[PDB]
Amino acid sequence: DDWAFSDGSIYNYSVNDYPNPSPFWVVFGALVGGGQPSTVYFSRRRGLGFANGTSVQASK
């Protein structure tokens, strides 16, 4: 259930090993038990830029 950003390479856990972040690949810490494929759902936050790069009230 643990994930991080990766650059398409495999990450094996170590006390001094860290994944290389990249916005195109996600690396998981371990395989899901049972050996069967599962579904990963991606939900993204999208920016608006209504106020010339500044914030606006949520009611607007």
Place this chain on the structure above:
Amino acid sequence: RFFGSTTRFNSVSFDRVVKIPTSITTQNNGSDPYYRMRLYKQSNRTGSPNLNEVVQPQLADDWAFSDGSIYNYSVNDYPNPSPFWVVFGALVGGGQPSTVYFSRRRGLGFANGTSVQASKIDVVVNGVQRTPIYTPGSAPDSVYRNYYTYFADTTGAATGTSSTSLVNGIFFDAIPLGLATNDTVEASNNTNIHIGSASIATRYNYNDGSYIPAFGLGDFADYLNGYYPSVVTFFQGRL
């Protein structure tokens, strides 16, 4: 262009041949003295993360440059060097894939192909200026996204040890290794020569006499002898 990673398989003997990422192989200039790389098995420098470069690779931690062919050890066998492939001496035990981390040293050429003092180079990553590292293991060595400076010629390479050391390239081999794949790096020479006396050697911070980075202008204008462009125009959205 400074830090990358790749998957090294450990199943069959041919899996000892590993391709360098394309972003790491660029600007090699036919293996110029500034084309230097160092391999790591971990993302930190703590512990034993070093992958040793040797002539005849023996162990799984020993590597050499290869031309995409397999290398089998012999007392009279040597790998054929090439800047695009890395060959390892043996497979990592367990048969599971591992990660090979590529860290490249990139040359600057600020002084018309000659060296400049290490205090004259300012590196900005993601809009924030970073502190150079001179003595390994010091206080700025444990901070992420910090850099070392070095000099390279046909007789070898030397890493900058002080602010007065003559260096012409940079790399990012700190205790935290490397950068994010989309990190932006801007290395600038802040030497305020051939300019007015009211100028300052600091980056633009809404000041007067600060410097604006010109990416690649020094490859054509001689910033050491003072040869600078004299005619400017605009054409098709290009200066």
